[PDB]
Structures are given as C-alpha cells and as structure tokens.
Design a binder for these strands. Structure first.
Lengths: 60, 105, 72, 50, 246
RNA sequence: GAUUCACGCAGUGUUAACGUGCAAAUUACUUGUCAUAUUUGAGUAUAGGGGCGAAAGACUCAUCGAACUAUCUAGUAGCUGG
RNA sequence: UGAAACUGUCCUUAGUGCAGAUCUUGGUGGUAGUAGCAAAUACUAAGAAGAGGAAAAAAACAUCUUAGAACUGAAGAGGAGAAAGGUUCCUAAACAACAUUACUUGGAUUAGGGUGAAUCGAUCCUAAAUUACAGAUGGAAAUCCUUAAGAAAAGGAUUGAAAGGGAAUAAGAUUAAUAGUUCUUAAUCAAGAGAAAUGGUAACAUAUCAUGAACUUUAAAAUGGAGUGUGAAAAUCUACGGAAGAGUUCUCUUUUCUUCUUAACAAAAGUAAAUUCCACUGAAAUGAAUCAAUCAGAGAAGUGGAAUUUAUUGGCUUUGUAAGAAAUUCAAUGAAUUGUGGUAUUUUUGCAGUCUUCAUAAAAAUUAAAGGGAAUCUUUUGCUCGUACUAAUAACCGCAACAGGUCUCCAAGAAGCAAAAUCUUUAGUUAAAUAGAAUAACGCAGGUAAGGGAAGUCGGCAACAUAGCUCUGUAAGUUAGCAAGAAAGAGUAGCUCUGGUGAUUAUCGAAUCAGAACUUUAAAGGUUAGGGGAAUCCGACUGUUUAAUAAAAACAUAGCAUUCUGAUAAAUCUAAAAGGUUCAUUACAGAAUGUGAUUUCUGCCCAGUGCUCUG
RNA sequence: UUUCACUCAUUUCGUUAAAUGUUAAAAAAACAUUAAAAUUGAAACAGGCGAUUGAAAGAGAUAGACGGGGAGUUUGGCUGG
RNA sequence: CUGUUGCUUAUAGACGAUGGCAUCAGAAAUCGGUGUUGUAAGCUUUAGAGUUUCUUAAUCAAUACUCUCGGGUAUUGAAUG
RNA sequence: AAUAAAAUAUUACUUUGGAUAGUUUAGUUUCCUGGGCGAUGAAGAACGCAAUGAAUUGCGAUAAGUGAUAGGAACAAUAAAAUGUGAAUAUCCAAAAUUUGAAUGCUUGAAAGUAUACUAAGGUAUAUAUGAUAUUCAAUAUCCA
C-alpha cells in the first residue's frame, strides 16, 4: 500500500513500482483520499514475496 | 421470512430496476437483476410477429449464431411466408399481364 | 403552513460554486453567476454596489505579477 | 451526498483539513496571541454553505 | 390594472402548443415535373391517429422518381381511403376519391379538400373533420377557378392549385355531447392551454375590464371597436349585430 | 369522472388542548376525502405596471391592493418627541 | 489608594457642560430560587468500573453484563437507497464546556484509522428545453435566429436524466470500519493478435461455418389504463417419512419448538401451459370453444407437425458449478444427516383474449436482417471520477437532540371481507426537554350515575344512542337510471352430529352452505363497527378555493347563446427585427365573451349611450 | 391628376433552388440504384431557381381622429364633529 | 420547660398548623368476630345430546351431581386478642 | 405594648462591570513625485508547499524558498544539520512559475474528459475579428483565341 500523486493513473503507478523496486505487479487498485492523496493497493506477482520488499524498503 | 435490500444504488421501481429474490445457501435470499421483456420482428407489410426468431435485446442478436437471427427464405427476416407468396405472385402475374396486354397485344 | 411546515422540502440547490469568482452564486437554471457575471467577459460591477467593488477588485488578492511590475 | 464531483470532493477535504486547532508549540512562541482558531466550525453548529 | 389573460397568451409561455406526440406536418408533396406533367402513384401504408386533430392521417408512401429510395409522405385522410389503396397525384390523374388533382381539372361541382390557397404551398383550406370545398366555376381566360369555402365564403384561386378529391374523414365529431368536465379536460391533451375559462365578471377590476362591483355585471356595452388596444378589447369585436338570430 | 373501507391527505366541529406553545399555525378526538379534473419526485419554462391564478386581489422564499436588495437619500414634513 | 506625567494666570480656538428624545452602545437589578424541567405505557434485582448511595430512609443512583418485566408489531421505533449534510463513520485517552438534574454515556473534547470496480453508477444518447461563429436588429447594453439567411455546420453545431435508453459477475469468507469493489473458487463482455453449403412438402432446422461492397428498406431499442382467467417461482399453511438439538413432565402430552439450503454462467435424462403458423381433408342435421368471449369455404373441428413466450442457456424437476461451501448437532481439528408431495392463501413475474378514449399514451445512441451483386481454440489489454456514515421522535430543512416537513425497495403468525383495530415471532429499544413524598382546591385527558328526558342553550354545541353478517320487508317522489343499507322485524353462543357442492378411476381433497338434538351466565359487540324520518332555501352533479380567523349559496363544469377571422387573417408579446405565441394549425378551426345540467320558456322597447352599414 | 399594361425594386411563399420558357423529336399493399451497346445512349438554347404580389402594400417623417389599455395629478373654505 | 425527631401517627391536613402515644411505646403476623362474591383445584365422583374403536369394554363430550354455606377477599381510613 | 429576622441609611474591605486617567506599530485631511497592467497570458479565483501549522504571511511541483550581486555572525517555542571555504537580511537582476481566469482547439455543473499535427509519457500549435505578404482556388463578373 502506497500514497501517490493524484495526477498518476493506474498504468503509471504499476510501471513506477516495477521500476523503483524491480518487481512484478499484477493488480493495482486506487482510492483518492479526502485530503487529496491517492492510496494505491499494489499486489505483487505470486512468485514475488512482499515480505522481502517491506524490509528492503524499511516498513519493518 | 427474510427481507432483502437493493444491491445497486438505484432505489426506485423503474423498468430497468427489475429485481428477483432467489434463495441461497443457509436460507438467505439474494437479489438478482432481471432483464426486460423485448419484442420480436414484424412482417414489413402485415405487421405479424415472425416465427423462428427469438425475442431478445438488439445487441444480443449479435451474440447469436449466424443462422439463429434469420430464416432461410426470400427476404427471410422481414416478411412472413404469406407476405412473400403475395410478392412472388404479384411480380409474376403482373409481368405476364404486362406481356400480353401491351408488348404485341 | 407558510412558515415552519413549508421549509421541509428545501433540498434542491439553486446556486452552486462559480468558477471565475469562487463564490456560491452560479445559478444552475439561469446558467449565469449572480456575483461575477460569468459567461460575460467583463466582471460584473455596478456603481450602486460600491461595497461590492471594494470586496473584490485590484489589490484584494495576491497581485502575483503586478506587484513586481509597479515596483519596477 | 454519496455521489460527488472530483473538484467538489477536494473542497470538502480542505474544509476538513482547516477544522483544526492551534498546535501547542505555536502557542509557546514569544508574544503569541493566537490560542484558539476562531474560524472553526462543527457539522451540527454551522453549515459551511457549499 | 394587470395584464389580462388574452395579453398573457401571446408570450409563448405555458400557453405553448402541446405538440410532442404529433405525427408531423400533413400536406401534399412538393410540386415537380412528375406532378405537373405526369402522375405519381402512392401507396397508403397505414391510417393513423394524429393527437390534437380530429381527422386521421394516412402514411402514404411514394417512389422517388429521380433518385433511388422512397418518399414517405403524410396526407390527411379523405373519407373512404383504406390501407393498400393506390392514390395518383398529378395533372393527368383520374377523378377518384383520394387522388390529388389541380383544381382546374375538376369539373364544376366537384367536392375537394386540402386545397392550396397559392400554388405549391401544400394545402390550406378544408382541413378539419368532415369539411370540404366545392368548385363553383372555371375561368380559362386568366387561369383562375372559383371555389366555395366551408365557411360559405367564395374564393378565387389559380387553376393549377392542387387539391384532394373527396371529404376529410372524421365527420360528425362535434355532434357527440361532451358530458363531463373530465372529458373536456382530455380534449386539450394535445392542444394549447385554454380550457377552464373564468368569466371576466367573476374577476376583479384590476384583472379584467369586466371586473365588477357589488353585483356581477358588465356595466358598459360589450360590443367594441376594432381599433381598441390589446387589454381593453374584451367581448364582441366590431359586432354588426347582437342577440339571438332569427 | 357509481357507493364505501384501508395506507395516505385535508382541515368541518369542539369555536377542545396550547396560546412568553412541541409549533412565528402545531396536537387530540370528530368530520371529510382517499386513481383519472387522482396523488407525487426530478428536470424544465414563465419575473416586477411583470409572471401565475377552476378567481380568494390569491401565490410569486415566514415579505404582495405591486417582492427582495442597493443608489438617488441625511427624500419632504405648516405635524409629534428631545 | 494610585506610580508618571501635570497645573495656575492672559489672549485665541472649539466636535465645550445632559435626567429625559419607545434616545444609541455596554453593564446590572426587583419579579425570582418564582413559572417551569408533565405527549411518545416502564422499569426492577445481582454484579463490574468509577471520586461519585451516601443514611437517624438522604425512599430517587448515569454506563456495561446477566435475569425478570415490557414496548415498536413487521405500510415497524427493522434492514437499505435518492436529495441534503460533510467526517457526524471505527477505536483509544479524557468529562472544563454542551444534550432545561446528573452522566463513568454521546451525533460533545483530543489523537489516530477508515471509502479498493473491465462487469455498480458518472462518462455515451437524446426528451421538455439550452447556448455558440457567421447573419439579422439595436443609440447602447444587448436581443433575435438553431439550420433558416452562410463558399460554415453524407447532412446538420453546444449543453440537457446518478429515476428515461444502455456491452459484460456471482456464491462463500474477510475488517474495530470497505466491499455486486478485497480474498478463494467459478464466469461474462468489448477491442485487438496468432463463382462461394445442406436438410424439410411446408411452417422451418443445422458446436463459426457454408464470401457478400456501395446504395435502399424493414424491425428492434420503443410505449396508456382497467378488469377477468391462468402458467411458473418465493413466502406462509399443510400430508407422508424421518435425522439432530431444545422446552414441559408428578397431572397428562407416541408431545410443543428449531435446522434439513444453494448463486452467476452453462447442460439437456424427463416433462408442462398459452398463442401463432404448416400438411392431409373439406363442415349444414352447422359445428368448435371461453369465467366472458370469439371463430370458420380468403377454410372450422380432427390427426400429425413447426415456431415463440414463461425473472440465464431452453419454462419446471434434474445436472455441471457443488459440497470441498453453508446450516443443525457431537467429540477434542475431526465426525454425522441434508426424501417425496398439495384440485389451499398471498406476493412477484409473464401470457391470452375483453373493455375504454373528441386521451391513442417519447426520441436518439446502438444492433440485426433483407433486396443488390461490387471485389476475388490460445493470448494481450480494459484508463479518469464516486464509493466511509445518517437518511431522520438526534446526522437533511424549520435559530435546537423542535410532537412540523421530506421521494423510494424488501415485508411473519393469530383473527377477519379487509395491508383495518388488538396481541405476538425475526430485528430494534427500555432512553428518548429530571426525579421522590403527600394524594387539598381549581384544572387538562378518559369515565359512570337514581327519577325525569332538551325543561339547558343563539342553536341537541358536547356527549349519549345506531353499528357486523343472514332472512323477511321496504313508501311518497322521480330525469324511470334512482330513492334504498329507505323505513321496519327476526336470527346469531358452546358442544355432539347430519346432508349438499369434486378429482382420479375403491383412494384423495377444498373451504363454503343448509339442518337437528343437548347445555348455559340466551350469544356481532373485547376490538372494528350507519342514528333515522317529514319538509323549506341555494348550487344541477364529480371537482376547486382566500398557505396562518371566511370551504361556502363563491369559482369550475358540461349544456345554451352571441361576435370577428379565408390564414399576407383574428387575437396578441417585443424598443427593433429574414422576430414570437395559438399554429406540427385551416371554419367540425382559431380568438373574444355572457349564462351555467335536464324539463318548460325566454315577453315589449333602437328614444339615450355603444357597435355597425353592403350606404 | 384618374384609369390602364408590364417588372425591375418590394412583399408572401417552396424545394435535394431536380425539367421554367421556346424550338426540336383506378383489377394486384411486389421490384426498380452502382448501364449495356455504338461523346451519344439520357435533344438544344435563354444571360429568369420556381411561383405570388407589385409600383400599390409595409417600415420612416409631418398632420387630423381615436385611444382609462397606460402615465402624472387634482378633487376650495367656513362648519356647536 | 419548649421545639426538632419517631409511630412511612390520627378524629387533622396543600405546606406549616392541629390532635394522640412515645418502653406498661410502637409495628407486624396469625387468630376469632364482621362483611363481599357465589359453591374453588382433584378425582377412577352420576346426569349427560351423541360419536368412535374394540366386539360391545374402552375412549371423546357443552354442561351437570357429591365432597362444598365451598374457595378467595376482608383495612387499605373496620372491630378483638 | 414589644421584636429587630426582614427593611432602610452611612463608612471601610471584598466582589460582578469596565467608566476614568496615562499611552499608541492605527486612522482622517492637505500637499509633492509618479500614475510604471495584459495573448511575452493581466487583475481575480482555486489548490498545494514549513521538522513539528489550523488561520495568517511568503511562495509555486526548483514550494515560509533557488542562482547572482551587496551583506557581515545569527535564528530560537523545541530539537537537528549547516555556518567567516560566508548565517541572517536586501533586491526594478537570472532561472522557475500548478488548475483556472479576456481564456483563446472542443466540452465544462460541483466535469470526470478529449481530436488532429509536430517534437509510449511529456511539451508546443490549432477560438473570433483583423493588416501586409505568399500560395491554392471560385465566378464568362469585363474582355478575349
């Protein structure tokens, strides 16, 4: 789950996540929050484990 | 009795807002969106509903097989069998009369 | 029933936010703004409304570019 | 309403963002008189008229 | 005072015509060579009911004589027309009911309908239910013929004005007595806003010139000059006579 | 565009309650009415000597025998108060 | 007391002296601890948390759990939406203020969290209508025109519906809160990528098949309402057989209660109702049929076929999905079951004909077919925006937690003609501007009353009284339709029985009607539930009306009558206008008026004022 | 000046401005289009798209009448009220 | 001495007041007297219009008989102990 | 006849209230100088940006600020980091300048969008009227082979 600029669509966010973290993305759902930010739910491919991306990013 | 709720955001008993209540697992009832009743084709002359063609929505005729959207005959989807027999007799008989009356009487 | 009872059905907006002046003065059915006179190219100003002139005019905003030019 | 335009929703969110009080650290500044936000409103007290 | 109800009627407000379900403009087809110097044949596909008018309309279908296609027309039914009938329009057409003939070819005493006041203007006179105009005489010296209008007035038209031979269908419509105010309400479903008419004497002096005082009456003569301005022209206008006729 | 009951709706009577009220017109019983000249939502049209009115000078944002708002305007007052 | 500026005399100057102006602004009294904190049936015991039930009864104690007792009564005080609100949603800490006492509670304070769509909507199309360039008009602002005026746009520009039209998704699970949106499983749709067919007599039929351009036509999208009959599904009720659990049990009760289910999308064992066509044949002694109708030599009935509709494929049972889910139990994750019917009621959704209109009850996007004969299974992608919550006796509009107002969907049992009144099950709640004691007057709301019965009073105002159903009986008057539920009289309970009304070929089933003994507290009456009659006046009737003192005899009405107008007209809007309305019209029409159904009848007057004249 | 004849301004109309002018040569609810053949087939020209009115009518100026449809205003004083 | 206080006090009472008793006080049961209504619940209780199953015994049955002048209530503003 | 509970009157102190006095980073008036906006997109509106900001101030995706030139050691409510190899601070300079707005490709309600051309995503141009030049056309309108 990320927070992205509203001016980015689902296709841009999928490509951005793949380029930034070198992974595969199979589904993106976006909801625009009240404040203005766009919450994005990026689901990675089954062969990609999101637990390793979290620690590499720093969420854990 | 189990009472239900509209699943979509429409809340008025409009023609396109038809619903059906069906039973499901555990005795719960769910809501389906049912389809409007359509009309068929009519003979271009006598206005009679043609036989052999279903009464579905205009776009669903495209999904049907090529043979299920018409009848194998002359004009075959726009004229009844009676509507066509009159057409054949009119064409032949009038031309024959136009051949004997005029055109070397 | 011209008082309390008649005010039950007031749930249909007449004016919505305008785009040029930012106020809730865009009449939906009339398709015009009652304050800044939208569609109209000229801003709506009247000499009898002397206060409405001082509420929105030059210098009541940011003056993003004019402040540099006049000081120049 | 449940249904709203995109621009109208953002102006709804800003009105939510502006309905906050003075942070405590700002209240400790030297020569500070801004203790309470007098532009505050609540849904059941004043309607923002938009 | 106020502006009376007759003044408010010319503004095109709620008094506009309720013509949404109407079939269309009912008239002859546009004049051409094939109508001036030949006959075109039409097929009466169906007879329909046009809201707001008392006569049925025939959905006649012609053939395009210069291009490929159909010329779907919309005539006013002459009494006796039936579906599948052939009607011929032109200068050489036979004198049968439903045929469209220039008014010069009709013998004196012919009963016609849907006559054109001016050549090629697609029908003006004798268009209500059961109405018709008779041909009085011809005048080949100036190519004019005389006809008798349904009001009884005599009118002189050009000898090439078209007309439909016969009687407009739907005759005897107004002989059936409306019995209920509800029935009269449904009569103006496809008409203008006129029905519930308040008597001017029941109004107030501001509303109407007849707006009276302590007794419901008029007060001044109800026969008025033609030159009265809009607003005071209420009652009988330029009345040459009054009272019950003998 | 028959007779009635019901969901609803109106407002005949008590000239009941209340009358610094639950309410800047409401409550209770009674009465009437309760689908075709019916009831009703949204959209749309009609604007000030104008509109709209089955007509009461009725309605036109608690404002109507001429709305609201601003300018002329600190309108004039042989009249009242200081 | 106060802690940094000020005073006396002479001239000058003035925004220079207040008790009033219903004076302006601000503050404060008596009234006064007074009037009140009384609609919405209602709370009680034990325990927990808390500073917050103490005490010589200080008789009352907010929140949460359990138990008792209750209310809304399924057209709800239930579960969800449109508008409107805008974070009120969920959780935690905390109670200064606010919810007419209090509050540990809160829609209140503080801090975080929360709204996931190729399939739902917006986006697309058009309706009433709306608005542009050029043109026309105007002193001007600006107005008109919306395809007519144009070197503009095969044909006509913009906007206009979260209720009209519309490509395509479901079941289970999941969160403190989102879910046709997430997860599992299972689908669908659109756009892409890898000399030209048979069968049937016919109606017509064939897992893509089996070529089909320009041009033209037809159909669909796309069409009122009422009433009657009926197919199917669901809910309720019920018949047979059970499996599991629960309640009652010293009086009985082989007993009473709960569960026993299944999606989108497709398949085709078995089998329906209605309608329309096709082939053979040719109807009279006329037949066929419906609750009603309705139909036949332009061909009935019969026999055999074809087609379409019946909430997705193909309507119902059945099947795949799919039991692996879900429900009810049991054991301590693992185990069990998940038949078959009804000539019953209601609801929903279709079908078939009948009735009714001086009413005939939308368009486009988009799709298919036809006439014509020009030419020679796998896979990718599906973008933008809304989505939390209330939707109201506390989240919307009325200054507010206001007995007012505000459009919808789903809808159990009893009893009954009834969706009535009254009671209850699922769900919700016991709080919704504070209580305790005493039990005066005068009140507001609900009642009863001896004998008399309108004598009260402007006046039977208020209240009382009649009230359902069955049978008998029913006048004057009348527009012959009505009056009429006229009026008036009798019957009605409980229990035990008897008989009538059918289906299948003896078995099975329906509430409805009639009758007879016996008993008693002698029977519609808990609730719901017409007072009746004799006349007079006005309006013919159904309808409308002064929002907030007039609901009517007033307005409307149908009917009757009069006037003008042949459309380049009549009426009439505009400052003007290839401007606008009736008019998508054409005298059976358009416009302007009076009287107000029907019956009977509308008398005399042209001087005065109007109007008119073919003069 | 009046009565005539015309159209050329002008008015009112109609269409896809689709054969104008002058020479030349009611049996049948059906189909009709993208041409063969040898520029014709499918004739030429007018200085008029086709009708209608027409120097009259409309809009302008000046002048007379009419005009509560509308605008502005007035409706003396004394007075046993 | 008097007042408060107690008898959730009466011969009194809107609140005060007033009247009575206060340890030989008070209160409460039970209990007898006195009233109201109309004969409780049970049963192997005798009448029961009729019905059913056995094969003639069961069972069902509004009401009705004995126990039963029963049962219940009775100061709360009743009278004793 | 008697009581001073209430009531009344004076002073001191306290209280509710904010008069009075002292004061001014605000106004009013007159005068002097200018009177310097915009298709190179103005004035106005909207949204966003601070380590802890709700308003306000300043600013624009290079964000309470960047470069350059002057400037010389601070800011501070609390931490950090940077800092004489240059902190604050100043500016008619340079770069940069979101969505709109005359608003101008088309549409715009609270509307999300979208067509073509040039240089997938980004960025430019394309409204109406108009002057000059260039180019392509139309009308026998005037002649004319």
């Amino acid at each position: 789950v990320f927070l992205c600029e509203q001016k980015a669509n689902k296709t841009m966010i999928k490509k951005a996540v793949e380029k930034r973290y070198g992974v595969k993305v199979i589904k993106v759902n976006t909801l625009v929050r009240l404040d203005g930010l766009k919450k994005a739910f990026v689901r990675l491919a089954p062969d990609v484990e999101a637990m390793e991306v979290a620690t590499k990013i720093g969420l854990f | 009795a189990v009472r239900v709720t509209y699943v979509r955001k429409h809340s008025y008993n409009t023609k396109s807002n038809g619903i059906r209540i069906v039973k499901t697992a555990g005795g719960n009832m769910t809501v389906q969106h049912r389809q409007k009743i359509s009309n068929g084709v009519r003979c271009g002359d006598c206005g009679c509903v043609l036989a052999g063609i279903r009464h579905i929505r205009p776009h669903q005729y495209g999904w049907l097989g090529k043979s299920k959207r018409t009848v194998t005959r002359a004009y075959g989807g726009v004229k009844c069998h009676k509507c066509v027999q009159k057409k054949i007799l009119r064409a032949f008989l009038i031309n024959e009369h136009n051949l004997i009356k005029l055109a070397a009487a | 029933t011209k008082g309390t009872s008649c005010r039950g059905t007031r749930h249909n907006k007449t004016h919505i936010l305008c785009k040029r002046c930012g106020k809730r003065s865009w009449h939906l059915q009339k398709q015009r703004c009652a304050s800044c006179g939208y569609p109209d190219a000229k801003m709506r100003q009247y000499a009898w409304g002397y206060k409405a002139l001082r509420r929105r005019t030059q210098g009541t905003g940011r003056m993003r570019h004019l402040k540099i030019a006049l000081k120049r | 309403t449940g249904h709203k335009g995109f621009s109208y929703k953002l102006k709804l969110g800003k009105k939510i963002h502006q309905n906050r009080g003075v942070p405590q650290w700002f209240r400790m500044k030297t020569g500070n008189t801004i203790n309470y936000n007098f532009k505050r409103r609540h849904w059941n007290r004043r309607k923002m008229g938009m | 005072g106020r502006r009376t109800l007759s003044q408010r009627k010319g503004r095109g407000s709620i008094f506009k015509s309720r013509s949404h379900h109407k079939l269309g403009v009912a008239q002859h087809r546009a004049i051409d060579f094939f109508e001036r110097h030949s006959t075109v044949r039409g097929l009466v596909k169906s007879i329909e009911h046009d809201p707001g008018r008392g006569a049925p309309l025939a959905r006649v279908v012609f053939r395009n004589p210069r291009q490929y296609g159909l010329d779907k027309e919309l005539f006013i039914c002459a009494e006796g027309l039936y579906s599948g009938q052939y009607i011929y329009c032109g200068s050489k057409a036979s004198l049968h009911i439903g045929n469209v003939l220039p008014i010069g070819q009709c013998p004196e005493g012919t009963v016609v309908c849907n006559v054109e006041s001016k050549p090629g203007d697609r029908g003006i006179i004798a268009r209500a239910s059961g109405n018709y105009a008779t041909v009085i005489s011809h005048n080949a010296d100036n190519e004019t013929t005389r006809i008798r209008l349904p009001s009884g007035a005599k009118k002189t038209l050009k000898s090439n004005c078209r007309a439909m031979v016969g009687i407009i269908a739907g005759g005897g419509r107004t002989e059936k007595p409306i019995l209920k105010a509800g029935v009269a309400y449904r009569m103006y479903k496809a008409k203008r806003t006129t029905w519930p008419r308040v008597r001017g004497v029941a109004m107030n002096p501001v509303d109407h010139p007849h707006g009276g005082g302590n007794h419901q009456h008029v007060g001044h003569p109800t026969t008025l000059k033609r030159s009265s301005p809009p607003g005071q022209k209420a009652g009988k206008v330029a009345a040459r006579r009054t009272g019950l006729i003998r």
